[PDB]
Design an enzyme around this catalytic site. Sequence first.
Site, mmCIF file in Angstrom:
data_model
loop_
_atom_site.group_PDB
_atom_site.id
_atom_site.type_symbol
_atom_site.label_atom_id
_atom_site.label_comp_id
_atom_site.label_asym_id
_atom_site.label_seq_id
_atom_site.Cartn_x
_atom_site.Cartn_y
_atom_site.Cartn_z
ATOM 1 N N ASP C 7 0.828 -1.230 -0.258
ATOM 2 C CA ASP C 7 0.332 0.121 -0.386
ATOM 3 C C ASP C 7 1.407 1.462 0.261
ATOM 4 O O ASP C 7 1.543 1.711 1.131
ATOM 5 C CB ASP C 7 -0.568 -0.166 1.553
ATOM 6 C CG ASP C 7 -2.057 0.803 0.623
ATOM 7 O OD1 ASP C 7 -1.391 1.737 1.218
ATOM 8 O OD2 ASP C 7 -3.169 0.851 1.315
ATOM 9 N N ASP C 105 -2.804 2.531 -5.808
ATOM 10 C CA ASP C 105 -1.711 2.402 -4.647
ATOM 11 C C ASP C 105 -1.631 1.282 -4.312
ATOM 12 O O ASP C 105 -1.253 1.473 -2.609
ATOM 13 C CB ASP C 105 -1.807 3.576 -4.084
ATOM 14 C CG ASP C 105 -3.031 4.159 -3.363
ATOM 15 O OD1 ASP C 105 -3.624 3.439 -4.005
ATOM 16 O OD2 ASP C 105 -3.442 4.762 -2.267
ATOM 17 N N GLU C 106 -1.990 0.434 -4.483
ATOM 18 C CA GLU C 106 -3.116 -1.078 -3.468
ATOM 19 C C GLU C 106 -2.255 -2.007 -4.787
ATOM 20 O O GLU C 106 -2.487 -1.680 -6.107
ATOM 21 C CB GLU C 106 -3.870 -0.599 -3.842
ATOM 22 C CG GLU C 106 -3.937 -0.343 -2.309
ATOM 23 C CD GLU C 106 -5.838 -0.443 -2.248
ATOM 24 O OE1 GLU C 106 -6.433 -0.258 -3.281
ATOM 25 O OE2 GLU C 106 -6.321 -0.757 -1.404
#
Lengths: 241, 249, 352
Positions: C7, C105-106
């Site tokens: 993350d 973002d993951e």
Amino acid sequence: MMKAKVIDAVSFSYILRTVGDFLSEANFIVTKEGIRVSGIDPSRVVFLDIFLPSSYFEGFEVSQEKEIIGFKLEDVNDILKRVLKDDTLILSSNESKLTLTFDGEFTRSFELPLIQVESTQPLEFPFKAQLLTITFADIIDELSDLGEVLNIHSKENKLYFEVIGDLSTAKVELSTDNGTLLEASGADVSSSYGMEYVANTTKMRRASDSMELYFGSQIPLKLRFKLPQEGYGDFYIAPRA
Amino acid sequence: MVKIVYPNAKDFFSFINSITNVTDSIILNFTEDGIFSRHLTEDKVLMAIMRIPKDVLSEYSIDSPTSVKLDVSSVKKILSKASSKKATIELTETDSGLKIIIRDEKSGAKSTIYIKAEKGQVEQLTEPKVNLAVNFTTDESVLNVIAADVTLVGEEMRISTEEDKIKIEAGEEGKRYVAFLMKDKPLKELSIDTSASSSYSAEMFKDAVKGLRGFSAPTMVSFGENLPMKIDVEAVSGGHMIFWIAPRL
Amino acid sequence: MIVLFVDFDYFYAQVEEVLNPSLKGKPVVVCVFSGRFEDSGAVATANYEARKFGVKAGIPIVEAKKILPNAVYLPMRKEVYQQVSSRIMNLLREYSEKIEIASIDEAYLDISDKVRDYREAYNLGLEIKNKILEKEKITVTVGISKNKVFAKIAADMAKPNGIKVIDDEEVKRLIRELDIADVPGIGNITAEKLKKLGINKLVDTLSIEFDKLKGMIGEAKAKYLISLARDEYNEPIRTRVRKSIGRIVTMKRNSRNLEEIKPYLFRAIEESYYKLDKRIPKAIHVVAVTEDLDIVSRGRTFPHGISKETAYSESVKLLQKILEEDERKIRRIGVRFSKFIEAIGLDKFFDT
């Protein structure tokens, strides 16, 4: 590339519905003279030949001395049913697509990719008559549900339509002497035609005020629906065997 | 005990019929703020919401917040009484469901239906929580043109902004449709905050559009970049019918 | 299975700090400026200095500005965040192929085939953190567990610039001890009913009737929470979204016999629809491999979907066309589906 604004979109759509009773697909043949559509139906009973002269349109423009636009009748006719009350219809094409644009309370276009349609080609008549197209359409609309066969004969320059079906019959006399024929002359001649084919053409009343009927024995029935300017929708219907 | 008086019976029937575009059975919820109904299709792509604030009812009284389920046959009973006449509707709870009295305003009688209906327990009204960048106002006639056009040409429609117009596209392989809508041709209003496009089921769009029938008010459509479309019409007598349509991603 | 979840920390705002290091340690607020008026829009992301004061994603820019008048407000520069994210995703692909990029973002890595146990998984997470810091100057949080949901919980518990393993013993503890609102996928909308239903923990869903779970509710969420509480949720890591799906099967013998080929073609169809699942295809192709190893195929497009029944009847017609158009025997027969209609529920816009 071509472009043409249709001055009477309703007449235009009824012409194409009539064509579509006989043809699945066709070519618009476009030249500076105007637009031609011809073909023979699957049964080979009917040959048709429509000419819409450039004057039938507004702002008719051409890039090419001859442009062949293949199309499916049903697709064009489906789109033409989408016309609104105040719409102007404009036909246009390029190398890849036919476009139908409705310009009205707002603008809407429908595009169809061109399709390859094989081009098509195939004389005088002992009898010839002229009449209003509304007169023909009224008479046929009435006879068309009585039987599958229209019998046509002439005697002393009078024309007779007769139908004997399974249950009922009719006989209509058309002549200059009564309200119904404009001009007529020739030999006493008799032939019969498939009623469904003739009944299909009564839609031509929405594009045509007068017409020419030609026939003779064991020869085609030609129906020329005269359109505005030099225009016509011709239908030739083979005689029954 | 729930007791309601609607001042406009015609609109009442319009709401019921509108919800029917999404479900055969209808749940009415009686809350402290008024009446609402909220239904989604099985795939959750289309939602119908009826919201009626109590301040537009002639009379509104509940004891506890309560739901009433109208099954397919009860919906049919109610709609079988649908009429354009000026009338009032009195809705009251019975032991087995509801009583609906329709009172003709101009002479002048009244007719009753009894509805067998399961009761109880209001479920909360949940809508997309979404910021919609583009809004425009038009009416049902325009949207019906669009819906018939898109549906003739493709299974999916795309709506986007292009300069100061809305563009609607649909198509399958070569065979395409494109329309442009702008202020005054034909739009009543047009607000474009940011440029945006999304794609939707043409069938679901058509179903929402069928749900605008009977309402004269202007219809507002809102959408955003890959976000649900909102379609909202306010009834003449008050309250809103809203449809939400999930985007294709 | 071992899932390693990455993350990126306060991502958009962190990228702005990399670009202008004189921002670090001050409140930084990246905003999406809409809309009709001055300062119309919402905060996209705030750094932790800004978050301290309650400025965070989704609050209106005007409300953020009232709270932190002197913070640094920046417009969203998506191109820049996207370039940085693509590079990092590319780095992560070098650790496992085997990666589901869940958003900008993951990312979820299945490292079951890369490491022996959680201690090795942990050290691999430190290398990944060091790598990404070296290449992009970006800190990230690593979460490691037995499935994607607990990997994400581990990263939730460790951020920012953290790394955490949730092992089998802790998974068992958290099913009992973790607030249900903290379970990934369950928004405040589902969880806030269960708070008043006496379901405050994941485990509390094992004492409610399965039917009573659908619910308040909804079947798919029911089968989700129940298999988490049951400790039977796995996985799996979905790598890139395919454009076509299908199956080809080898036949026992070369044939041109429709009646002999049909059962093989129908089973390909069967295997295929299982994989399509919720995807409705608009196109079908039948694919044949001929005795001499040529490939012959024929397809058709249906503007509305193709149901499994349509695929059964249409595939036979396309096979007939092949047989009419090629004289050769076929040895393998298969089907592929494409041009998918994929509906997403109004769901995914309620939460939360």
